[PDB]
């Protein structure tokens, strides 16, 4: 079956709060769907690598270490979850 209709759980006020922490004052109406596409591409690229690592460890559970290793793979190193 095809999975869909979840990206919209990243809501307009949530994207707005992220923009605020980024210092953004005024937000065009088209930004929200654009930010959803951006975040999906990001999550796709990282989860793909995380799963590749998980697969190789012969596991069925994605570990924080799999993600940490994947973030590091993409040049997006993350502190506070291991490694």
């Amino acid at each position: 079956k095809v999975l869909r209709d979840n990206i919209q759980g990243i809501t307009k006020p949530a994207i707005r709060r992220l923009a605020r922490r980024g210092g953004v004052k005024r937000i065009s109406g088209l930004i929200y769907e654009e930010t959803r596409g951006v975040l999906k591409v990001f999550l796709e690229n990282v989860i793909r690598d995380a799963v590749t690592y998980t697969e190789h460890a012969k596991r069925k559970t994605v570990t924080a270490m799999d993600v940490v290793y994947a973030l590091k793979r993409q040049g997006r190193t993350l502190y506070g979850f291991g490694g």
Binding site: Y53, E55, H56
Partner: protein
């Protein structure tokens, strides 16, 4: 006298002949191919190295090279790469 430097030049030629029998290559272009192979070698090897360490293993086996190839290469490029890899490994062990 004389000093020996190894390169993949002869193998790049051999492969060039497979894909384009009627075409050649400059020295500069040859040096790029050489750089390219070394770079990609280092990149897969490094990833395979890390995979082994992450899993607490002393050995880099084809399976590490295979995963390395899938973290490294993009989509279609990986699919074909995994094929040629698995293929050559099969042919090799069945010629022991």
């Amino acid at each position: 006298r004389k000093t020996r430097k190894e390169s993949y030049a002869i193998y790049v030629y051999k492969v060039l002949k497979q894909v384009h029998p009627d075409t050649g290559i400059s020295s500069k272009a040859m040096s790029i191919m050489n750089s390219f192979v070394n770079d990609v070698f280092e990149r897969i090897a490094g990833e395979a190295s890390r995979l082994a360490h992450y899993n607490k293993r002393s050995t880099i086996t084809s399976r590490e090279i295979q995963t390395a190839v899938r973290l490294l290469l993009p989509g279609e490029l990986a699919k074909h790469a995994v094929s040629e890899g698995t293929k050559a490994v099969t042919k090799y062990t069945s010629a022991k």
